[PDB]
């Protein structure tokens, strides 16, 4: 059960507390796409993981237009 | 005819003179791509322009003033903020109930710039109740140019995921999207789909809203739209969905999503390549039925090809796809991967500078080896022959101790006599 959850996550390495206090394997399924977390995978076993369903690259040239000026009537 | 003169005549109690002056201020604000906005803001014209919105007796003046304000708000955050700090926003909302289309439309436009400035501005314009008046304009009798502006503001309303748009907004906007996704106009279609992007980007709860609306069977087919701008956005939208749960992912696959991917994996544009394998990487992170579906759709060799000959971006996405399959899949599913010659193009990525990719490849190799049991040596031999072992061997350096440790254990468990 617990290792099935973890099959959705990439173990990156040692705990990195930049990413908060260790989580439970059950709390792991509350992450956002691509989100890194520290998780407790056994007694005295805390590692950094990344979610395998991932985030997208930042768009730039692809359609944005947040603000638009009106140059003329038509 | 100076700026200081313009602000003076704009104060006149006469309306002809005033309108003329406000028209002049608008003209200074639409003469190029870098208008004298800061100067206009400093002239004291802002409160005057704002008060003109009150003038129901003069739609020309309301429209001209709104136009000048719109252009000031099209600028930087500080310049947009100057407009909202003049208390313009509630008057724009008022003008959305104007019986005159010109005034309505310029109010919509100006509000779009203000909404687009950020989530706080978005939330404020929303809380005053912009969405329902906005979406009411959507009718078949509305002029396309008007409708394009509405749909653009609709996007801005959906943008920013921390904090994401409120429940009420999303529930209002989704059924309007169901309508607009059927439009033939390309600009509108693009916006409708980008609004769905952002909606699906706020996470799994919002994705369920998009799914529950019934819009996805109409969205997946836009992966093959003749218009690349539509495809790019539909790829992002549907792609966001399949970062959701397995059940959510399945909703998309059941709309025959994977049939659309040969033409994206071989697309001329590398950006489309990259986003296509990104998408597919999120599928190989699914269950076994979903890994099987990628295989059955004959997509793996195009993945391994892009993994081999693609630009770095697409290769990065390709390695994840492979690695994700390597832990999602059955034994035979991985066997297929190997007999499709994944081992050499996968190993060649161990040289790249992006450390994450390298751990992702190393993680892949490790799963492959721990999974193929009698074939550990057999696959060990594949890794070695393409020069992978050589690449793994010298990843045993300390510049990345996570990479190091993983390189060591593979070599200790699988390549030590």
Q: Do A69 and B203 touch (CB under 8 A)?
A: no
Contact list in A for residue B112 (CB cut-off 8 A) is 67-68
What is the nearest CA distance from B215 to chain A, expressed in angstroms? Answer: 21
Give the strand order in the sheet containing A45-51.
A9-14, A45-51, A36-42
* Distance in angstroms (rounded) separating the CA atoms of residues B60 and B284: 58
* Residue A52 · residue B324 · CB < 8 Å: yes
Return d(Cα B20, Cα A72) in angstroms, integer.
17
To test the contact with chain A by mutation, choose from B400, B402, B404 the residue with the greatest count of A C-beta atoms within 10 A, namely B402
**Contact at CB, B194 and A66, closer than 8 angstroms:** no
Say if A3 is an interface residue toward chain B (CB within 8 Å).
no
Closest CA to B295 of B337, B358, B330: B337
Instruction: Provide the 8-state DSSP code for A62.
Output: S
CA atoms within 13 A on the CB side of B411: 15
* Structural domains in chain B, sorted by start: 1-417 (1.25.10.10)
Nearby residues of B292 by Cβ (< 8 Å), 6 or more positions away: B333
Residue of chain A minimizing CA distance to B280: A53
Element housing A22 (H / E): none
Cβ contact (<8 Å) for B152 and A68?
yes
Are B285 and A8 within 8 A, CB to CB? Answer: yes
Furthest CA-CA distance within chain B: 97
Strands A45-51 and A9-14, by their bridges, are antiparallel
Is A53 within 8 Å of B285 when comparing Cβ atoms? yes
Q: Test A54 with B281 for CB contact under 8 angstroms.
A: yes
Q: Which residue in B149, B196, B327 has the most chain A C-beta atoms within 10 A of its own C-beta, making it the best mutation to test that interface?
A: B327
Report yes or no: A68 at the B interface, CB cutoff 8 Å. Answer: yes
Cβ proximity of A55 and A34 under 8 Å = yes
Three-class secondary structure of residue A8 per DSSP: helix
Q: Are B313 and A57 in contact (CB < 8 Å)?
A: yes
Residues B345, A73: Cα–Cα separation, whole Å: 55
Asked if B340 and B302 touch (Cβ cutoff 8 Å), the reply is no
CB pairs under 8 A between A and B: 90
Phi then psi for residue B176, to 5 deg, are -75, -30
**Nearest alpha-carbon partner for B349 in B377, B400, B312:** B312
Tokens of B20: 């003329």
B16: tokens are: 């002809």
- Name the resolution in angstroms: 2.7
Token pair of B224 as six digits: 């093959």
Residues in B touching A56 (Cβ below 8 Å): 236, 239-240, 275, 278
CA–CA dist B25, B190 (Å, integer)? 33
**Token pair recorded at residue B332:** 């035979």
Contacts A65 to B, Cβ<8 Å: 152, 155
Residues B138 and B177: beta-carbon distance below 8 Å: no
In three-state secondary structure terms, A34 is coil
Which residues from chain A sit within 8 angstroms of residue B33, using beta carbons?
69
Token code pair at residue B415: 């390549």
Instruction: Determine the distance in angstroms separating the CA of A32 from the nearest CA of chain B, rounded to an integer.
Output: 7
B203 to chain A, closest Cα gap in Å: 7
Residue B251: closest CA among B195, B292, B204, B212: B212
Tell me if A52 sits within 8 A of A46, measured CB to CB. Answer: no
Cis preceding-peptide flag for B374 (omega within 30 of 0): no
Helix, coil or strand: residue A6:
helix
- Looking up tokens 């607009």 gives B180
Q: DSSP state, A23?
A: B
**B367-406: string of b/e by CB count within 10 Å (b at 16+)?**
bbbebbeebbeebbebbbebebbebbeebeeeebebbeeb
CB proximity list for A65: less than 8 A, separation 6 or greater: B152, B155
The answer to whether residues A6 and A28 touch, using CB atoms and an 8 Å cutoff, is: yes
Gap from A46 CA to chain B (nearest CA, Å):
14
- Quick one: residue A6, left, alpha or beta (phi over 0 = left, psi -120 to 50 = alpha)? alpha
Label residues B112-144 b or e (16+ Cβ within 10 Å = b). Answer: bbbbbbbeebbbebbeeebbebbbebeeeeeee
With CB atoms and an 8 Å threshold, state whether A66 touches B281: no
Contact B198, B159 (CB under 8 A): yes
- Residue A2: in which H helix or E strand, if any? helix A2-5
Tokens of B205: 């709860």
Q: How many angstroms away from the CA of B406 is the closest CA of chain A?
A: 9
Domains of chain A: 1-74 (3.30.30.90)
Whole-number Å distance between alpha carbons of B406 and B232: 37
Contact assessment for residue A49 and residue A9, using Cβ atoms and an 8 Å cutoff: yes
Rounded to 5°, the CA angle B361-B366-B369 comes to 125
Asked whether the beta carbons of A19 and A48 are under 8 A apart, the reply is yes
Q: How does strand A36-42 pair with strand A9-14?
A: unpaired
B203, with CB counted inside 10 A (0-12, 13-18, 19+), is: middle
In chain A, positions 39-58, which contact chain B (CB-CB < 8 Å)? Answer: 52-57
Give the three-state DSSP class for A18. Answer: helix
- Write out chain B in H/E/C secondary structure: CCHHHHHHHCCCCCHHHHHHHHHHHHHHCCCCCCCCHHHHHHCCHHHHHHHHCCCCCCHHHHHHHHHHHHHHHCCCHHHHHHHHCCCCHHHHHHHCCCCCHHHHHHHHHHHHHHHCCCHHHHHHHHHCCCHHHHHHCCCCCCCHHHHHHHHHHHHHHHCCCCCCCCHHHHHHHHHHHHHHCCCCCHHHHHHHHHHHHHHHHCCHHHHHHHHHHCCHHHHHHHHHCCCHHHHHHHHHHHHHHCCCCHHHHHHHHCCCHHHHCHHHHCCCCHHHHHHHHHHHHHHCCCCHHHHHHHHHCCCHHHHHHHHHHCCHHHHHHHHHHHHHHHHHCCHHHHHHHHHCCCHHHHHHHHHCCCHHHHHHHHHHHHHHHHHCCCCHHHHHHHHHHCCHHHHHHCCCCCCCHHHHHHHHHHHHHHCCC
Rounded distance, CA B128 to CA B240, Å?
A: 30
> What does residue B188 show for φ and ψ, rounded to 5 degrees?
-70, -40
Phi and psi torsions of A49, nearest 5°: -130, 165
Cβ A33–B159 below 8 Å, yes or no? no
CB contact under 8 A, B152 and A63: no
What helix, strand, coil percent values describe chain A, rounded to 5?
Answer: 20, 30, 55
Asked whether B80 and B91 are in contact (CB, 8 A), the reply is no
């Amino acid at each position: 059960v617990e290792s099935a959850v973890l099959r959705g996550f990439l173990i990156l390495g040692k705990e990195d507390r930049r990413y908060g206090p260790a989580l439970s394997i059950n709390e792991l399924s509350n992450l956002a796409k691509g989100e890194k977390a520290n998780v407790l995978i056994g007694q005295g076993d805390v590692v950094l993981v990344m979610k395998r369903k991932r985030d997208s690259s930042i768009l730039t040239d692809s359609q944005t237009a947040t603000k638009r000026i009106r140059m003329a009537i038509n | 005819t100076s700026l200081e003169a313009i602000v003076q005549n704009a104060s006149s109690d006469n309306q002809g003179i005033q309108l003329s002056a406000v028209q002049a201020a608008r003209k200074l604000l639409s003469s190029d791509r870098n208008p004298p906005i800061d100067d206009l803001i400093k002239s004291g014209i802002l409160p005057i322009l704002v008060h003109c919105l009150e003038r129901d007796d003069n739609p020309s003046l309301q429209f001209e003033a709104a136009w000048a304000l719109t252009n000031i708000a099209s600028g930087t955050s500080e310049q947009t903020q100057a407009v909202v700090q003049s208390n313009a926003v509630p008057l724009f909302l008022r003008l959305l109930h104007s019986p005159h289309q010109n005034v309505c439309e310029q109010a919509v436009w100006a509000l779009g710039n203000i909404i687009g400035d950020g989530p706080q501005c978005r939330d404020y314009v929303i809380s005053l109740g912009v969405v329902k008046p906005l979406l009411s304009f959507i009718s078949p009798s509305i002029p396309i140019t008007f409708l394009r502006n509405v749909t653009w503001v609709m996007v801005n309303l959906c943008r920013h995921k921390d904090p994401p748009p409120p429940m009420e907004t999303i529930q209002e906007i989704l059924p309007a999207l169901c309508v607009l996704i059927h439009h033939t106009d390309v600009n509108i279609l693009v916006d409708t789909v980008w609004a769905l992007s952002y909606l699906t980007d706020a996470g799994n709860e919002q994705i369920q809203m998009v799914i529950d609306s019934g819009i996805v069977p109409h969205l997946v087919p836009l992966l093959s739209h003749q218009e690349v701008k539509v495809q790019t956005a539909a790829l992002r939208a549907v792609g966001n969905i399949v970062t959701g749960t397995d059940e959510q992912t399945q909703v998309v696959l059941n709309c025959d999503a994977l049939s659309h991917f040969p033409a994206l994996l071989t697309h001329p544009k590398e950006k489309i390549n990259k986003e296509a394998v990104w998408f597919l990487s999120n599928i190989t992170a699914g269950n076994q039925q979903q890994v099987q579906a990628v295989i059955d759709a004959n997509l793996v060799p195009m993945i391994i090809h892009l993994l081999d000959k693609g630009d770095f971006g697409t290769q990065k996405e390709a390695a994840w796809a492979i690695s994700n399959l390597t832990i999602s899949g059955r034994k035979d599913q991985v066997a297929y991967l190997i007999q499709q010659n994944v081992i050499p193009p996968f190993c060649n990525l161990l040289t790249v500078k992006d450390a994450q990719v390298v751990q992702v490849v190393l993680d892949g190799l490790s799963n492959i080896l721990k999974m193929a049991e009698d074939e550990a040596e057999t696959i060990g031999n594949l890794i070695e022959e393409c020069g992978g072992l050589e690449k793994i061997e010298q990843l045993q350096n300390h510049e990345n101790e996570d990479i190091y440790k993983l390189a060591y254990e593979i070599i200790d468990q699988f390549f030590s006599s």
